[PDB]
Amino acid sequence: ISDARANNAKTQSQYQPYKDAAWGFINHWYPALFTHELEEDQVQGIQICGVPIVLRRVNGKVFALKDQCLHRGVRLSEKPTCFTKSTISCWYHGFTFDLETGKLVTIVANPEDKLIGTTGVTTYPVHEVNGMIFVFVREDDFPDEDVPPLAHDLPFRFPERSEQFPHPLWPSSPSVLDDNAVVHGMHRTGFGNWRIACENGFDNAHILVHKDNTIVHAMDWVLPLGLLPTSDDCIAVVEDDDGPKGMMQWLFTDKWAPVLENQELGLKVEGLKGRHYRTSVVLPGVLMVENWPEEHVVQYEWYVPITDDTHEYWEILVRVCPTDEDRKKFQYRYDHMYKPLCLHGFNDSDLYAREAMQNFYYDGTGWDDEQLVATDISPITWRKLASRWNRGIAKPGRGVAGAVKDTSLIFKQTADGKRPGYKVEQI
Amino acid sequence: ISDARANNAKTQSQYQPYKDAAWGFINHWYPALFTHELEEDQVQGIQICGVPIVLRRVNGKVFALKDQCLHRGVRLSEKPTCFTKSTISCWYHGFTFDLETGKLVTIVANPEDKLIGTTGVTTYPVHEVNGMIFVFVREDDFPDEDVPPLAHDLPFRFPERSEQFPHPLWPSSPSVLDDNAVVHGMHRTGFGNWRIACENGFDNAHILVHKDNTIVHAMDWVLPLGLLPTSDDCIAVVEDDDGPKGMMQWLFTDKWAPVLENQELGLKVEGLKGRHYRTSVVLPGVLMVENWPEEHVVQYEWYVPITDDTHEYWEILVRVCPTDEDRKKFQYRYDHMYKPLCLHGFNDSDLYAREAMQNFYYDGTGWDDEQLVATDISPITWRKLASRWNRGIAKPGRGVAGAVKDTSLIFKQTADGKRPGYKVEQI
Amino acid sequence: ISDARANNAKTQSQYQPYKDAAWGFINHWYPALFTHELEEDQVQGIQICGVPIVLRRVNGKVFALKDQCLHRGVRLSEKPTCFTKSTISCWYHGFTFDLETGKLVTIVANPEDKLIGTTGVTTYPVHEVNGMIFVFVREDDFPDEDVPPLAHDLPFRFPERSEQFPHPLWPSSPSVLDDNAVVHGMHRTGFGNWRIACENGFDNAHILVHKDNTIVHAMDWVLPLGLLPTSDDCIAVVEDDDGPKGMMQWLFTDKWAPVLENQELGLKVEGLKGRHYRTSVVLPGVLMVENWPEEHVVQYEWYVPITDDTHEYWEILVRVCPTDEDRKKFQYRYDHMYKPLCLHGFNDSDLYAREAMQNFYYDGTGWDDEQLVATDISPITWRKLASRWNRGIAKPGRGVAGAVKDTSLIFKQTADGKRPGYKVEQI
Ligand SMILES: O=c1ccc2ccccc2[nH]1
Ligand SMILES: O=c1ccc2ccccc2[nH]1
Ligand SMILES: O=c1ccc2ccccc2[nH]1
Ligand code: FES
Ligand code: FES
Ligand code: FES
Ligand SMILES: [Fe+3]
Ligand SMILES: [Fe+3]
Ligand SMILES: [Fe+3]
């Protein structure tokens, strides 16, 4: 281990809370499911930050409660059982909970038990918008009064912040919160800790991983070998009370110099199609790639912690489409261009890159022995701000799926060919 | 956690040994194999309470020894090697053991070694009766003269105890010990701890899990949403020296009131076919369901600990059949009725219910955080008596399969598609 | 546990370092790949003694470096990326290393970083000969000038040592080092610790495992039930500075008496075709079977530790073939005789025998509780000499594949049907 590495002792001491957040940052908004994954009267179980959650849509509205019956701890989502529009029951011994408050309102065949009304399961705020269902995953005692607006946990918005983050080379990127904003994308389970997956996206030295991607050569893009920071303010850290907590990288300004060649190794980025974009990341770990893959379109990614060694990777493209005609155009371009060449192809390379790095960090070795360099100003800056502004460090799961990694149940599922997942299998 | 739960500190302190028996209660009788699973000269390896056991039938008689060669620990049952009617040898280096005493009588190519005769492997008492092979799984130092009769670890017998446990609504249930008693059923590995699986069977609130079983609607049975205890003596605890240690639930008396409806949730048990039955459980955890699924027929279930997170679930129906004609009638009704609709269909629901609860308890969380209620007087009573009368608590396996859950051998088998099991695979 | 066992307290205290070497003996030569597994410009990743290693052949020469980018710990071998004949780069962020020295010579898109030239990855000496690529697996601080010749970690050579180890009953066995020596064989991943796999080969009581092998009856050989030591010097321990450290068993002399029958168990070796051979073993655990399976042919086996519970089992036959005609004859006899009946068939029995013994030892039980006898003078003598002469005890892997056994990546691969392995899968 060399003394020339950027992550010296002083630096590492500045992001200890981050090193301690293997299970994720709790008391934050996270995408749970796409709207199309939860239809009227549909019940679905998931897990975020080690917390089991069950969702149900009733009369168009989505509710989220802890997917754990307080009687004997079974998941309520395994065999959806709802007798009324305002409740959800446990299919085992009948404990029934209020969808709105989570209170134990009754027990199917024991309506007079003294336990009734004296407790309940945790509820989770829901915010559904433009095809996406967001859930505020919180600790059992986090007060309702303290739940912040979804926007505080989403990337910086434009044109609102165009003055703060000038972007003369491209039109303003839309937000999932914008009217008529349309979302196209997917989410799949990633194998490995969320942090390692998250740091990949806004790292300007990692773009080497895409040197051979088909889209790069089909579009004849000008994708440099990497970018280099030229000043100490190459990244702007934002931490104002009202608004997202994160950072903006001044890409395509002199603060980040592109490297298009290395004669010594025989490398040279040949391409004439200019490709302008800009990355930023905000808690709980949301990436925004402005002007990607084309003008008026933006890419957002999430790395939702499921357990301490699995995460749900979200990848979406957003574009404001005011007319039916605009939507069809976007849908078409997504189907025959973006999805196959970008979300798949371009980003698939990131999938394996993130995985390949997991073994170094899981047992703690990497958090101490990694030897960072100049370009690592990005992940380091993120780790420090995340350590400073997270709303809580999730505790390890106890008495829930994932609390123990080598159960006979997990070996049974694995034997059957089922990989670690996210959405609870029913029946 | 509410203070209104039935399992308060005082109550929990009364079943600590039960909480400590994840690997099972040792020094007890357990069903090992059905007679048809061990033919003349056949050798089979199994595991109970973490103890590897090998069985061989010679001249019609079944013998059981520890399935662990004392030389270098291989399982004798993996490659059956018996050179004489009175012994069993290890296929690796030839250590040979007397079937009757387990003593090391010789070594194939080293007959004069000083180790010979100075030690041996543990032997286990066997009691085969009416199609079932029972084995007394005991500690290495449990004395032969202390081995109790099989009947002490089997459900209460009728008509013998008809006066003690009056049953005016149905004829006496036969015992596996009765003359001409015929057994039909099966056993299969269950994924999860034996205790959690065992408590499901005699829980009168869990019957909600069967509300949709085909047999219930085909027979138009009257299966209530659940039963409620009406008095403190709704369960009779029996603990007399000579006889089984367990409890009898006074089902179909005032002590247990049926709940056939819940207007508030829109539920109502419609059915005119009366279905009378009664459950009881005795150590080491044997369920008896009198008058099920029909008069003169009784169901017995075992949840045999294999390791601390797997068990062998036994499900059988018994009926005394004095004539060849009687046997054919029973075999036919089993084949085209009981098996498809009862053992499967009805009880398959229990399979998944038991599994769904395991995650809450494995790491210990559930044993402390569960919030039991009135109907839980059943499991609680069982836990207490089990704690007071068990003949020993099995120690974790050491140097045997299952001692370590994440070995490369297990990952190899899992990769090959093999689930955790019970019967040792040979060759 | 009997007091008549050969492994008494005093004896066990003499091989404690061996009990401590679950991850293998480091600073030793091990076979890595066959020459045919690494062609010109080919890159391959493996793991030995818990150390990740990547090899590349350039201009006919093979180089070996630690398969771990010092930047953020990914394996360099997962996506081979070499820009010049003298280097290998990390496909993720461009760190580039010198094949010869392992020094960090540059970073693709950050050629001026101060970290460059101040560190590098470990290099491993390579010795390719007659179709086999040997690698000297060493600790990061083991001096180049201290690397010993390959011959020191290979079995004793003949005729060089024919006087020291007289063999009147068969011609001298060739070495892999001999000119015109031809190698035919294979290596496959073994499931279980390397030590337990290794001790099987030179155990003269284990041959009982082959009593039913097809080759034995087709050749009508004379394979005794086992051999017995008759004197204290039945094994010669060699530990001279210049040369291999190991032991030679005086098979086919009066020091080892064959046992061809056991009337008491009805066993009798009925064979008239004499089969003369001799076994020896040297650090790091290399077996030599002289005159096997025929004259002028010798069998060598390795049990290379990968992790502490997996090893790469090597099985090869060597014969000196001076002419093209000789090579074809050897190839033909290997293809239609040795491979199907010897490497497979005869030795496949050992595969499962070794596996069946692993559970007893992994958690440490077997190393203390095994009850060894007279014939175990072989494994005991080996354990003592290994404890005394090993060049180092490998430390458990940290931050590398195998450091943690139950990662989600491992369950993902297992679910996909992939068994624990050795060669790193690419792309
Ligand atoms: O640095 C970068 C460059 C391109 C890119 C594209 C999609 C997602 C994240 C990305 N990050
Ligand atoms: O409470 C019950 C009710 C029915 C039943 C049927 C088979 C086995 C166990 C059973 N337990
Ligand atoms: O003791 C023995 C006897 C035969 C043999 C054959 C191949 C490999 C190892 C062997 N060891
Ligand atoms: S576990 Fe849910 S009602 Fe019993
Ligand atoms: S392990 Fe059974 S004789 Fe050696
Ligand atoms: S992990 Fe290899 S250059 Fe970054
Ligand atoms: Fe990328
Ligand atoms: Fe049931
Ligand atoms: Fe062998």
Side-chain angles (χ1 to χ4, degrees), chain A residues 1-162 164-427, chain B residues 1-162 164-427, chain C residues 1-162 164-427:
Chain A
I1 293 183
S2 175
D3 300 357
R5 62 175 183 166
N7 59 143
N8 52 218
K10 192 286 189 91
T11 301
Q12 302 198 197
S13 64
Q14 291 179 288
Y15 50 75
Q16 183 61 55
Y18 185 87
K19 289 185 175 181
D20 298 344
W23 288 81
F25 289 128
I26 195 150
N27 298 147
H28 276 92
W29 286 94
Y30 292 93
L33 297 170
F34 280 117
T35 294
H36 65 72
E37 289 180 291
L38 193 72
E39 297 179 354
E40 179 66 20
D41 257 351
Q42 184 172 3
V43 171
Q44 183 65 63
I46 58 177
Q47 192 178 196
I48 300 178
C49 288
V51 184
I53 300 172
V54 58
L55 303 84
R56 184 190 178 197
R57 182 188 298 286
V58 178
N59 297 323
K61 185 181 189 178
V62 183
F63 296 86
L65 290 67
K66 187 183 297 172
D67 197 6
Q68 180 191 65
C69 180
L70 62 77
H71 179 218
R72 299 195 66 173
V74 303
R75 283 182 295 204
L76 303 170
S77 68
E78 284 188 39
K79 198 192 178 194
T81 303
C82 303
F83 303 111
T84 73
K85 287 282 195 301
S86 71
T87 64
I88 179 165
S89 304
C90 176
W91 44 274
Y92 207 171
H93 308 97
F95 277 45
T96 304
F97 313 86
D98 180 67
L99 290 175
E100 181 75 58
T101 69
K103 184 179 72 177
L104 176 57
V105 300
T106 188
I107 298 176
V108 177
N110 186 12
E112 304 196 354
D113 200 88
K114 59 159 123 74
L115 186 70
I116 296 179
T118 73
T119 181
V121 297
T122 312
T123 63
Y124 305 93
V126 174
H127 192 315
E128 187 177 11
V129 57
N130 296 316
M132 291 181 78
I133 297 172
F134 288 89
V135 174
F136 186 71
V137 190
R138 62 172 174 185
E139 304 182 85
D140 291 343
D141 62 358
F142 190 92
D144 294 354
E145 304 84 318
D146 290 350
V147 178
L150 171 61
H152 285 193
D153 281 355
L154 288 180
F156 305 107
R157 302 182 67 176
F158 297 87
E160 166 182 337
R161 308 215 162 186
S162 290
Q164 187 175 181
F165 311 112
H167 51 94
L169 303 179
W170 60 76
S172 296
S173 294
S175 168
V176 168
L177 293 175
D178 287 345
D179 284 353
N180 290 151
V182 173
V183 173
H184 286 310
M186 51 193 30
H187 64 80
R188 77 244 278 186
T189 304
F191 308 96
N193 183 73
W194 77 276
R195 295 167 301 180
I196 294 301
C198 178
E199 297 182 1
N200 165 282
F202 54 90
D203 187 304
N204 302 301
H206 99 280
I207 51 179
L208 183 58
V209 191
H210 304 286
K211 45 123 54 292
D212 303 344
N213 293 341
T214 313
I215 189 167
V216 174
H217 302 84
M219 306 276 246
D220 190 55
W221 283 343
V222 194
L223 202 64
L225 303 180
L227 305 190
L228 283 170
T230 67
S231 60
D232 273 350
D233 56 352
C234 59
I235 297 176
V237 180
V238 180
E239 41 201 356
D240 305 72
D241 55 298
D242 186 300
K245 302 301 182 304
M247 58 188 232
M248 172 64 69
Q249 308 195 298
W250 301 110
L251 304 190
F252 295 80
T253 70
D254 13 319
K255 298 181 183 304
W256 284 98
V259 170
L260 292 69
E261 179 182 359
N262 186 157
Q263 308 154 180
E264 181 169 304
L265 299 180
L267 294 173
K268 184 179 181 177
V269 183
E270 315 268 54
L272 307 180
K273 177 93 300 187
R275 190 74 280 292
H276 307 292
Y277 63 87
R278 183 169 66 185
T279 56
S280 59
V281 60
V282 301
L283 277 164
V286 196
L287 174 81
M288 172 172 65
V289 193
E290 299 169 63
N291 211 55
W292 188 279
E294 290 172 336
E295 292 192 354
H296 298 126
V297 184
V298 57
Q299 186 163 317
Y300 291 111
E301 302 190 340
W302 280 266
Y303 317 85
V304 190
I306 300 174
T307 63
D308 64 325
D309 74 354
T310 57
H311 62 278
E312 192 66 7
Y313 170 58
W314 291 68
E315 192 183 5
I316 66 173
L317 295 181
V318 185
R319 176 168 191 144
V320 172
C321 303
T323 72
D324 200 357
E325 173 52 7
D326 293 319
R327 300 186 195 51
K328 294 182 182 183
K329 289 293 187 178
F330 185 39
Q331 182 67 262
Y332 186 91
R333 199 154 185 69
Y334 173 71
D335 291 352
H336 307 292
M337 224 283 257
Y338 304 151
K339 189 179 184 179
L341 291 182
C342 296
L343 301 203
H344 282 305
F346 189 85
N347 288 117
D348 279 348
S349 296
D350 293 306
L351 230 194
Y352 307 91
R354 298 167 189 148
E355 251 180 41
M357 178 170 40
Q358 303 286 6
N359 281 165
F360 189 52
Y361 296 87
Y362 193 68
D363 66 9
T365 300
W367 298 110
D368 292 355
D369 293 2
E370 69 192 337
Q371 298 189 59
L372 306 185
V373 295
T375 49
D376 289 314
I377 179 61
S378 295
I380 295 171
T381 299
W382 152 249
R383 297 181 185 174
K384 292 179 183 179
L385 80 83
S387 297
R388 286 186 268 121
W389 298 94
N390 72 75
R391 302 202 192 84
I393 295 172
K395 275 140 55 296
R398 301 304 177 190
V400 301
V404 182
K405 305 192 196 318
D406 56 0
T407 67
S408 56
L409 271 170
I410 285 173
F411 279 109
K412 169 198 181 179
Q413 298 172 190
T414 307
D416 291 355
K418 303 172 182 173
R419 296 171 164 189
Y422 174 61
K423 292 169 73 177
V424 176
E425 190 182 1
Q426 302 182 178
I427 297 181
Chain B
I1 294 184
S2 174
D3 298 355
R5 63 175 182 170
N7 58 142
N8 54 216
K10 191 284 189 79
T11 298
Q12 300 200 201
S13 70
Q14 290 179 292
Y15 52 68
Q16 183 60 53
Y18 188 82
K19 285 185 180 186
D20 297 346
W23 287 81
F25 288 128
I26 195 158
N27 297 150
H28 279 87
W29 286 98
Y30 292 97
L33 295 167
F34 282 115
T35 295
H36 66 68
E37 287 180 289
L38 197 71
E39 297 177 354
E40 177 63 20
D41 254 354
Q42 184 173 359
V43 170
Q44 185 63 69
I46 56 177
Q47 192 178 192
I48 298 179
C49 284
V51 185
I53 301 171
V54 56
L55 300 87
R56 182 190 181 196
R57 183 191 296 288
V58 183
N59 295 320
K61 184 179 186 181
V62 179
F63 297 82
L65 292 65
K66 188 182 292 178
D67 196 10
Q68 180 193 66
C69 183
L70 61 78
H71 180 218
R72 298 193 64 176
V74 305
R75 283 182 297 204
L76 306 166
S77 73
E78 279 187 38
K79 198 195 173 195
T81 298
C82 304
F83 303 111
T84 74
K85 289 279 194 299
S86 68
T87 65
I88 179 161
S89 301
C90 180
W91 45 276
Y92 206 169
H93 308 97
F95 274 44
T96 304
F97 314 84
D98 178 65
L99 289 173
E100 180 76 63
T101 66
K103 181 179 76 176
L104 174 55
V105 296
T106 187
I107 298 175
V108 178
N110 186 11
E112 305 196 344
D113 199 89
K114 61 158 123 81
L115 183 74
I116 296 172
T118 70
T119 179
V121 295
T122 309
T123 65
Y124 304 93
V126 172
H127 191 315
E128 190 177 7
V129 60
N130 293 316
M132 288 183 83
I133 298 174
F134 288 89
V135 175
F136 189 71
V137 189
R138 62 173 174 179
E139 305 180 83
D140 292 343
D141 66 3
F142 189 92
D144 295 359
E145 39 286 76
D146 285 353
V147 176
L150 171 61
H152 286 192
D153 283 354
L154 287 177
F156 306 108
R157 307 179 62 175
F158 297 90
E160 170 183 341
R161 326 263 278 210
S162 293
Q164 187 175 182
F165 310 116
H167 50 94
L169 301 180
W170 59 78
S172 296
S173 294
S175 166
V176 166
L177 295 173
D178 292 344
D179 283 0
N180 291 151
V182 176
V183 177
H184 286 310
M186 51 202 167
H187 64 84
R188 65 192 136 183
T189 306
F191 311 93
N193 188 74
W194 76 275
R195 294 168 302 180
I196 293 303
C198 176
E199 300 179 4
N200 164 284
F202 54 95
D203 189 297
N204 298 299
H206 99 276
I207 49 179
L208 182 61
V209 194
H210 302 292
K211 60 174 286 70
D212 301 351
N213 293 342
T214 37
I215 190 164
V216 174
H217 302 81
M219 308 281 248
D220 189 56
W221 284 342
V222 196
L223 196 68
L225 304 181
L227 306 184
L228 285 169
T230 65
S231 62
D232 275 352
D233 58 352
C234 59
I235 296 177
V237 179
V238 182
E239 41 198 356
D240 305 69
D241 51 299
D242 185 301
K245 305 299 184 301
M247 57 186 236
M248 173 60 72
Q249 305 195 295
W250 300 112
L251 300 193
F252 293 84
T253 71
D254 327 6
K255 301 181 186 306
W256 283 99
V259 169
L260 292 67
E261 178 177 358
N262 189 154
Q263 306 157 178
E264 183 169 304
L265 300 178
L267 294 171
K268 186 178 180 176
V269 184
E270 314 267 55
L272 309 182
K273 179 90 297 183
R275 189 75 279 290
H276 307 292
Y277 63 86
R278 183 170 63 184
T279 53
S280 61
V281 60
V282 300
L283 275 165
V286 196
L287 175 77
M288 170 171 68
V289 190
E290 304 169 54
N291 208 56
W292 186 281
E294 289 173 342
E295 291 194 357
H296 298 123
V297 185
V298 63
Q299 189 168 322
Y300 293 111
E301 298 191 347
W302 281 266
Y303 316 87
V304 186
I306 298 173
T307 59
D308 64 325
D309 75 358
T310 57
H311 63 278
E312 192 66 7
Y313 169 54
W314 290 67
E315 198 178 0
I316 68 172
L317 293 181
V318 183
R319 182 173 187 136
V320 174
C321 303
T323 71
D324 201 0
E325 234 303 276
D326 291 331
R327 308 210 231 329
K328 297 186 178 181
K329 289 290 183 183
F330 186 39
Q331 180 74 255
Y332 184 89
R333 201 158 181 70
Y334 174 71
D335 291 357
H336 310 286
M337 226 283 258
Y338 305 154
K339 190 180 185 182
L341 296 179
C342 298
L343 301 197
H344 283 305
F346 189 84
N347 291 119
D348 277 350
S349 297
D350 292 308
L351 237 189
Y352 307 89
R354 300 163 183 155
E355 246 180 45
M357 180 167 41
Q358 306 287 7
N359 279 166
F360 188 50
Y361 295 88
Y362 194 70
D363 69 5
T365 301
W367 296 111
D368 295 352
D369 294 359
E370 67 189 340
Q371 299 191 61
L372 307 189
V373 292
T375 47
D376 290 311
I377 180 63
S378 295
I380 293 175
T381 299
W382 152 250
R383 293 183 188 173
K384 290 181 187 178
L385 80 84
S387 295
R388 311 192 315 265
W389 296 99
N390 74 78
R391 300 200 195 82
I393 292 169
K395 274 140 56 294
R398 302 304 179 188
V400 297
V404 180
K405 306 197 193 318
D406 57 357
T407 68
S408 63
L409 277 169
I410 287 170
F411 280 107
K412 171 204 181 177
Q413 299 167 193
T414 307
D416 289 356
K418 303 178 181 168
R419 296 172 162 192
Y422 173 64
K423 294 170 71 174
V424 172
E425 192 183 357
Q426 302 182 179
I427 301 179
Chain C
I1 296 177
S2 169
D3 300 352
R5 66 178 177 167
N7 58 142
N8 50 219
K10 189 291 187 84
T11 297
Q12 300 194 205
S13 72
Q14 291 178 289
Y15 53 71
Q16 182 60 51
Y18 187 85
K19 288 186 179 183
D20 295 347
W23 288 80
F25 289 128
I26 197 165
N27 299 144
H28 278 91
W29 286 95
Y30 291 96
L33 296 170
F34 280 113
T35 294
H36 66 71
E37 291 182 288
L38 196 70
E39 293 176 353
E40 178 63 19
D41 253 354
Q42 185 174 358
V43 169
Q44 184 62 67
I46 60 180
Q47 188 175 201
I48 298 177
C49 284
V51 182
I53 299 171
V54 52
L55 303 85
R56 179 192 182 198
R57 182 187 297 285
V58 181
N59 295 317
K61 184 178 186 178
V62 179
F63 296 84
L65 291 69
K66 188 182 293 180
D67 196 7
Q68 181 195 64
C69 182
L70 59 82
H71 181 217
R72 297 195 66 175
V74 304
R75 284 183 295 205
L76 301 171
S77 71
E78 282 182 43
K79 199 192 174 194
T81 302
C82 301
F83 301 108
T84 70
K85 289 280 195 297
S86 63
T87 65
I88 181 170
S89 307
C90 178
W91 43 276
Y92 207 171
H93 307 95
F95 274 46
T96 304
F97 315 85
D98 176 63
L99 292 176
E100 183 73 60
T101 70
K103 184 180 76 173
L104 174 61
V105 300
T106 193
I107 299 171
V108 176
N110 186 9
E112 308 225 343
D113 201 273
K114 61 160 119 81
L115 186 69
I116 296 171
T118 70
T119 181
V121 293
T122 310
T123 63
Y124 303 93
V126 174
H127 192 317
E128 186 174 12
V129 56
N130 294 316
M132 287 182 83
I133 299 172
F134 288 88
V135 175
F136 187 68
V137 187
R138 57 167 174 184
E139 309 178 86
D140 293 343
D141 63 5
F142 191 86
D144 291 356
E145 43 280 71
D146 286 356
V147 176
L150 173 62
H152 285 194
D153 285 358
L154 290 182
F156 307 108
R157 304 178 67 176
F158 297 86
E160 164 180 342
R161 306 221 166 179
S162 290
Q164 184 174 185
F165 310 117
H167 50 98
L169 304 180
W170 60 78
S172 295
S173 291
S175 167
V176 166
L177 293 176
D178 292 343
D179 286 358
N180 292 146
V182 176
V183 174
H184 285 307
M186 47 187 43
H187 63 85
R188 48 162 73 106
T189 300
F191 309 95
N193 185 73
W194 76 273
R195 295 167 299 178
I196 297 304
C198 174
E199 299 182 5
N200 168 282
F202 55 89
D203 187 312
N204 301 297
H206 98 281
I207 51 179
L208 179 63
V209 186
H210 304 284
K211 61 176 288 67
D212 299 343
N213 293 343
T214 317
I215 191 166
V216 172
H217 301 82
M219 307 278 246
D220 184 56
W221 279 340
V222 189
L223 246 186
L225 304 181
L227 309 181
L228 286 168
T230 68
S231 61
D232 273 352
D233 59 351
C234 61
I235 300 179
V237 179
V238 182
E239 46 200 354
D240 304 76
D241 53 297
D242 186 297
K245 302 298 181 304
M247 57 186 237
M248 174 66 70
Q249 308 200 293
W250 298 114
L251 306 195
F252 294 81
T253 70
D254 11 313
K255 295 181 189 305
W256 286 97
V259 167
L260 289 69
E261 180 179 357
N262 190 151
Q263 303 160 176
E264 182 165 307
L265 300 179
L267 292 172
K268 184 176 183 174
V269 183
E270 313 262 53
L272 303 184
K273 175 94 299 184
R275 189 74 282 292
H276 308 290
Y277 63 85
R278 183 168 63 185
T279 54
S280 63
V281 59
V282 303
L283 277 164
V286 195
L287 171 80
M288 171 170 63
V289 194
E290 294 164 71
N291 209 56
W292 188 279
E294 289 171 339
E295 292 196 357
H296 300 121
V297 189
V298 61
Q299 185 164 324
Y300 292 114
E301 302 193 338
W302 280 263
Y303 317 85
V304 188
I306 300 175
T307 62
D308 63 325
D309 73 0
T310 58
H311 62 278
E312 194 63 10
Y313 169 58
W314 291 67
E315 199 178 358
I316 70 169
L317 295 180
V318 186
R319 177 171 191 134
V320 172
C321 304
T323 72
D324 203 1
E325 232 305 279
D326 287 330
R327 308 211 231 328
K328 297 186 178 180
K329 291 291 185 179
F330 187 36
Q331 183 68 260
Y332 185 90
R333 199 162 184 68
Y334 172 72
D335 291 350
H336 307 294
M337 220 283 254
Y338 304 153
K339 191 180 186 181
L341 294 180
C342 297
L343 300 202
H344 283 304
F346 189 83
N347 288 115
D348 279 347
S349 295
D350 296 303
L351 224 190
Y352 307 90
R354 301 167 187 147
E355 253 182 41
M357 175 168 47
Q358 302 287 5
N359 278 166
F360 187 48
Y361 295 86
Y362 193 69
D363 70 6
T365 300
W367 298 107
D368 292 355
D369 294 5
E370 65 188 346
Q371 298 189 59
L372 307 187
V373 291
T375 47
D376 289 316
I377 179 61
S378 299
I380 292 173
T381 302
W382 152 248
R383 297 184 185 174
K384 291 184 189 177
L385 81 82
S387 296
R388 287 183 269 124
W389 297 95
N390 75 77
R391 303 201 194 84
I393 294 174
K395 295 194 294 56
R398 302 303 182 190
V400 301
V404 183
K405 304 190 198 321
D406 56 354
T407 67
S408 60
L409 273 170
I410 285 169
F411 280 102
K412 174 200 180 174
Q413 303 175 188
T414 308
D416 284 1
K418 302 174 184 172
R419 297 170 161 189
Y422 175 63
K423 294 168 71 177
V424 177
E425 193 184 358
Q426 303 181 179
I427 293 184

